[PDB]
Amino acid sequence: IDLIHDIEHVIQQFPTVRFTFNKNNGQLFLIGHVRNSIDKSELLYKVDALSFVKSVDDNVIDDEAVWQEMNILLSKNPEFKGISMQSPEPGIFVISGYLKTEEQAACLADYLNLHFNYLSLLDNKVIIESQVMKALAGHLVQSGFANVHVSFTNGEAVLTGYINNKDADKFRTVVQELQDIAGIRAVKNFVVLLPAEEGVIDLNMRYPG
User: Fold this and answer.
1) How far apart are CA 45 and CA 57, in angstroms?
2) Intra-chain end-to-end CA distance of the chain, in Å
3) How far apart are CA 36 and CA 9, in angstroms?
4) Does 142 fall in a domain?
5) What are residue 156's phi and psi, to 5 degrees?
6) Residue 108 and residue 99 in contact, taking contact as beta carbons nearer than 8 Å
7) Which residue among 62, 90, 112 closes a domain?
8) Does 2 lie in the same domain as 44?
9) Same domain assignment for residues 152 and 181
10) I need a labelling partner for 38 at 20 to 30 A (CA). Which of 10, 27, 107, 148 fits?
11) CB atoms within 10 A of CB 56
């Protein structure tokens, strides 16, 4: 029982790690995930140090080898090369980046189905560009700017069109709020500010050609 407490003192430091210890032959069987091969070596050498452990059967996954391997596969795929995988902790994988459409999103899911061994542990954070653009276009319409047109690629929103000169401060506000959405890193504003036509006609009359 002090044996159980001694193994636990070690393995508790490596969340997800589990074991079985066979007292007939002194064998420890380990399973689960660690952050990287450095953590793995720490784990193995600490359990080995336990004087009652004669052998270690090591089935622990190095999560770093796992996501690095996957990033190598995605990198070679022209469809997915802006997509990468990480792990913010043992046993949790996170896939992130931008795709253009829902169809490319479905292609990626199929791909990961065929290539990735830990789907049940995978968190999906990929941003779909076609979706972000509906969100943006809907905010502009809500606000009275239907009017202003938007494109969106790779975290970058581009605005074009024309606004009424009166509307400058309302629009500045609408642009602030578009910055605080989903996977938006930058807004590039090319919208023209129209002056009152009557005001232009009038400056045409009082200055020489």
Assistant:
1) 13
2) 100
3) 20
4) yes
5) -110, 115
6) yes
7) 62
8) yes
9) yes
10) 27
11) 19
Structure tokens at 177: 């709020």
Solving technique for this entry? X-ray
Q: What is the 3-state secondary structure (H, E, C) of the chain?
A: CHHHHHHHHHHCCCCCCEEEEECCCCEEEEEEEECCHHHHHHHHHHHHCCCCCCEEEEEEEEHHHHHHHHHHHHHCCHHHCCCEEEEEECCEEEEECEECCHHHHHHHHHHHHHHCCCHHHEEECCEEHHHHHHHHHHHHHHCCCCCCEEEEECCEEEEECEEEHHHHHHHHHHHHHHHCCCCCCEEEECCEEECCHHHHHHHHHHCCC
Amino acid (1-letter code) at residue 195 = P
Domain identity same for 108 and 141: no
Which of 110, 128, 146 is the last residue in one of the domains?
A: 128
Phi-psi region of 2 (alpha: psi -120 to 50; beta: other; left: phi over 0): alpha
* Residue 14 in tokens: 């490596």
Rounded to an integer, what distance in angstroms lies between the CA atom of residue 124 and that of residue 104? 14
Q: Which of 78, 68, 80, 76 is nearest to 112 (CA)?
A: 80
What resolution in angstrom units was achieved for this structure? 2.3
Which residues form the domain of 14? 1-62
Residues 131, 153: Cα–Cα separation, whole Å: 11
Taking the C-alpha atoms of residue 26 and residue 28, their distance in angstroms, rounded to an integer, is 7
The answer to whether 90 and 110 are in contact (CB under 8 A) is no
Assigned domain for 206 exists: no
* Residues forming beta bridges with residue 153, ordered by sequence position: 156
